[PDB]
């Protein structure tokens, strides 16, 4: 919620769209297309794996028994032993909550921030030709073909051709 | 597996386990908790 | 520098099943889609599917169908191929390979060494 | 199949050669074509991606092109070291999967 992009002011996504996480959905004279970026859809996949990599590390570190399972250690130290090992418990725990809320927190905005890198992108690409109607959306003001989609689409696109065109409009 | 108890072995990458808070050997740490699921997508918002 | 590492050679009997490892060393492969191909002796490369395990997509070619099995554990960086019902027809090398991406259409530019599987009676 | 090589071609060192891979509509007319070469008993090694594109380890010798439903793989310069088997590749979108051409035998004259 962080960057307003993904359940902001686009309403929702595509179950659809089973080929990426981020993509195009365009409406023009020949018909509707859609097809996932591939850009940045690797880049947000690439931060959680990044993530995943530094958690399912294995601790190198080893402990042992102080402890006795079949007859029981001494009453007292017993006890030390025993309130040591509930003190860890408890510190281990709400690092593991944390840690988790955490990481989740940082993964959702991680998400809204590419969504709203896509966006910012095409909105630059496209100059003066077009509008931002604010839905997750640009109303292009000059007729347009399915390879001018795709000229958005791997970035090509050029303004300066379709400018005076668009702009009585 | 490097992570044994009185009742078996814990074998796992994940970092914690709901287990034994006696394990001994290389262990996830013991926590409280049963479950605690980190996010791997994105927020679902479906219609 | 990744390098994909497969299991060894197999050698089965009619009907078993096999299941063939390719561990990604030297980095993760678990941002990367990655496809398992076959080699008939003296045939052509043949796709089997593929999995992008981050990504969560398991993909099959029709002809193989609800006889393969691929799947991955991404915290050992693994990917795994199982074929099940197997005859002298499956008598095979078998690679793994990623794609330059986590999906199925890009070139695949890192390939294992290959898996022999030989199927007998 | 799905994609048709020729099972052989051969030329001598410092020839060009050709090899052409011919598809239908649902892969080659509108899906990206691979090139993969291969030793034998080794792994395919990829050599031509998105159609025209080149492994920054690949040798300029190698080309690719694409039209309509065919696809072409040009050497120069032909070198002792090409004698591989070459195939052709695309995703087919009839299919749902990745398809290979039946490979093509390159043999070094001379």
């Known amino acids: 919620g962080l960057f307003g992009a993904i359940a902001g002011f686009i309403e929702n996504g595509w179950e659809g769209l089973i080929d990426g996480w981020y993509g195009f959905r365009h409406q023009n004279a020949q018909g509707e297309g859609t097809a996932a970026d591939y850009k940045s859809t690797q880049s947000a996949i690439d931060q959680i794996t990044g993530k995943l990599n530094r958690l399912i590390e294995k601790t190198n570190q080893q402990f042992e028994l102080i402890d006795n399972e079949f007859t029981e250690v001494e009453r007292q130290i017993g006890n030390v032993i025993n309130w040591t090992r509930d003190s860890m418990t408890e510190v281990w725990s709400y690092n593991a909550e944390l840690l988790v809320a955490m990481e989740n927190q940082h993964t959702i905005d991680l998400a809204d921030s590419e969504m709203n890198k896509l966006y910012e992108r095409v909105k630059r690409q496209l100059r003066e030709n077009a509008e931002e109607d604010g839905t997750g959306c640009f109303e292009i003001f000059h007729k347009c073909d399915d390879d001018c989609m795709a000229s958005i689409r791997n970035n090509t696109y050029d303004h300066s051709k379709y400018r005076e065109e668009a702009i009585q409009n | 597996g490097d992570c044994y108890h009185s009742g078996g072995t814990i074998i796992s990458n994940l970092p914690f386990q709901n287990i034994n808070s006696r394990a001994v050997g290389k262990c996830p740490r013991y926590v409280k908790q049963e479950s605690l699921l980190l996010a791997t997508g994105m927020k679902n918002v479906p219609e | 520098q990744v390098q994909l590492v497969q299991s060894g050679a197999e050698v089965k009997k009619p009907g078993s099943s096999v299941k063939v490892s390719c561990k990604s060393s030297?980095?993760?492969?678990?941002?990367?889609?990655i496809s398992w191909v076959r080699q008939a002796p003296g045939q052509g490369l043949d796709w089997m599917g593929g999995?992008?395990?981050?990504?969560?997509?398991?993909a099959y070619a029709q002809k193989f169908q609800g006889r393969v099995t691929i799947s991955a554990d991404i915290f050992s960086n693994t990917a795994y191929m199982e074929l099940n019902s197997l005859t002298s027809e499956d008598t095979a090398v078998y690679f793994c390979?990623?794609?330059?991406?986590?999906?199925?259409?890009?070139?695949?530019?890192?390939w294992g060494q290959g898996t022999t599987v030989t199927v007998s009676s | 199949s799905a994609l048709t090589q020729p099972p052989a071609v051969s030329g001598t060192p410092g020839q060009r050669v050709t090899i052409s891979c011919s598809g239908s509509?649902?892969?080659?007319?509108?899906?990206?074509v691979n090139w993969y070469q291969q030793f034998p008993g080794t792994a395919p090694k990829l050599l031509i991606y998105?159609?025209?594109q080149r492994p920054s380890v690949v040798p300029d010798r190698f080309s690719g092109s694409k039209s309509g439903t065919s696809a072409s793989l040009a050497i120069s310069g032909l070198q002792s070291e090409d004698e591989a088997e070459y195939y052709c590749?695309?995703?087919?979108?009839?299919?749902?999967?990745?398809?290979f051409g039946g490979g093509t035998q390159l043999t070094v004259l001379g």
């Open positions: 030297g980095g993760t492969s678990n941002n990367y889609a």
């Open positions: 590749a695309a995703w087919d979108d009839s299919l749902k999967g990745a398809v």
């Open positions: 509509d649902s892969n080659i007319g509108r899906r990206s």
């Open positions: 998105s159609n025209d």
């Open positions: 999995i992008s395990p981050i990504f969560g997509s398991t």
């Open positions: 390979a990623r794609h330059g991406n986590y999906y199925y259409y890009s070139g695949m530019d890192v």
